[PDB]
Structure 1
Amino acid sequence: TSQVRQNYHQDSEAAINRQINLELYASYVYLSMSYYFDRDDVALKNFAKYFLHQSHEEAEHAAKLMKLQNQRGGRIFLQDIKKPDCDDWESGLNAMECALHLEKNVNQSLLELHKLATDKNDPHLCDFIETHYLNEQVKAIKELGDHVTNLRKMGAPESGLAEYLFDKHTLG
């Protein structure tokens, strides 16, 4: 056992590793989206920039989780980062909807993690999740919902002008 480990259940350690893999997967999904919008036949540079920023933020989340795993005396166990479900989205609106679904899945995983930490009476882990992940997830979900709403109201995906103007005015 680690000399620093205290009140750190093995179930919590395993769930933290699963969350690390989930954050890495989300980052790599966002990377796929970003370079989809960099394509010559899509060419929405601000969508690409937005999703690249999201990918970097997800990477940061993963790194923070690994740092906590080491802080608590757990052992990081990495797994394959699976390829994203889609190589194509055919519209900025569809990518935003997929991002919203992904963020909600990540949020559900974080909520299950918080429930596990509460059951294991690990207040440090609960506070870590609450302070660094829960409100960030809520803000991200709200922002993506706003983007989806605006794109739908503007006439996307059937209107390329809508996506162009959204790229220029909201994401630019």
Structure 2
Amino acid sequence: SSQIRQNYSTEVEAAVNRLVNLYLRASYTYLSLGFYFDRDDVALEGVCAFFRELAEEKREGAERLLKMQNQRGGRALFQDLQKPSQDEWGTTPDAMKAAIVLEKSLNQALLDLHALGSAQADPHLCDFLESHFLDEEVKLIKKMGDHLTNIQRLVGSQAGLGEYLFERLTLKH
């Protein structure tokens, strides 16, 4: 039961639960991406760290959604988390491309939920999504696009050398 729920539709409640699943799926995907780059036959630690950081960011996003669900008086419902789409992630550009596709899918899910919020006249939801999610997605996708452009520029010259240089000079910290 709840004694606090106000202006919070069942449609939004369900969409928030689905979004939590998407964010946790994304986190899982990034966990797989990170460890792939830590394989001794891949060995690009800056790339491992980049994706591991994203895994943490996506988990944090799911937790923020869940906190908000409870703040509004909605009820968390969890579903199975599907395994990531690949077991091996190819080259650095392959991985960065996959990451952009993933982020665009999350961004579209956020946009869809914001639209539902608007249709349901739920300004708390719509603002929650922008502050913690929509601006972060735009910034993140720009960073990934910039990364992809740099790695593409590098591997068009020399693939092995380019991947090493990108990891050493852009990613490693």
SS at the partner of 1:36?
Answer: helix
TM-score (structure 1 length as normaliser) = 0.98
Alignment length (residue pairs):
172
SS of the residue 2:124 aligns to = helix
Which residue number in structure 2 is paired with residue 104 of structure 1? 104
Structure 2 counterpart of 1:125, one-letter code? L
Q: Structure 1, residues 117-145: CA drift from partner, whole Å, max 9, x if none? A: 00000000000001110000001110100
Structure 2 CA distance for partners of 1:158 and 1:20, relative to 1, 3 Å: farther
Letter in 1 for 2:33: M
Confirm whether residue 116 of structure 1 aligns to residue 111 of structure 2.
Answer: no
The alignment's C-alpha RMSD in Å is 1.1
Q: With structure 2 as the length reference, what TM-score do the two structures score? A: 0.97
- Shift, 1:64, TM fit: 0.1
Matched AA of 1:139: K
Task: Write out the 4+ residue segments of structure 1 that deviate beyond 4 Å after TM superposition.
Answer: none
Query: Aligned pair in 2 of structure 1 residues 156, 50: CA closer, same or farther (>3 Å)?
Result: farther
Return 5+ residue gaps in structure 2 as ranges.
none
Structure 1 counterpart of 2:46: 46
Q: Are 1:133 and 2:133 matched, yes or no? A: yes
Partner of 2:150: 150
1:90 corresponds in structure 2 to 90
Structure 1: distance between partners of 2:138 and 2:156: 24
Residue 158 of structure 1, CA deviation: 6.2
Shift of 1:89: 1.5
